[PDB]
Design a protein around this ligand. Structure first.
Ligand code: BEF
Length: 124
């Protein structure tokens, strides 16, 4: 039993406002960060029920973030907004406890329609 904690990383100010407001309606604490590293820092003192991160900056495009997540977070449900290169890092993400790899489409319909089933498929 948790109080729904969803963490996202993409743009922030724009994606956040939409997600922080929409996700909160369902009954979960939604928060955003720079792209993924910040989360790796904040995550050090708190693990969210579900997490979302971009994939265009880290040495390994984006999946690199997963490589970091799985270093401090044994099994953290991390979802990505895109899968352009280094797909092998994505496969390794599922191995540690990553949800899936979704296309750039995020806003709310796509982002939420996925985050929900994510927790739904985990809460039994
Ligand atoms: F790298 Be993100 F998907 F724009």
């Amino acid at each position: 039993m948790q109080r729904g904690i969803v963490w996202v990383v993409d743009d922030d100010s724009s994606i956040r406002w939409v997600l922080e407001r929409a996700l909160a309606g369902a009954g979960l604490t939604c928060t955003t960060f720079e792209n993924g590293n910040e989360v790796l820092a904040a995550l050090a003192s708190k693990t969210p029920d579900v997490l979302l991160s971009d994939i265009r900056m880290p040495g390994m495009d984006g999946l690199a973030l997963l490589k970091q997540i799985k270093q401090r977070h044994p099994m953290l449900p991390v979802i990505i907004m895109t899968a352009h290169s280094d797909l092998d890092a994505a496969v390794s993400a599922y191995q540690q406890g990553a949800f899936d790899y979704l296309p750039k489409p995020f806003d709310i319909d796509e982002a939420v329609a996925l985050v929900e089933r994510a927790i739904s498929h985990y809460q039994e």
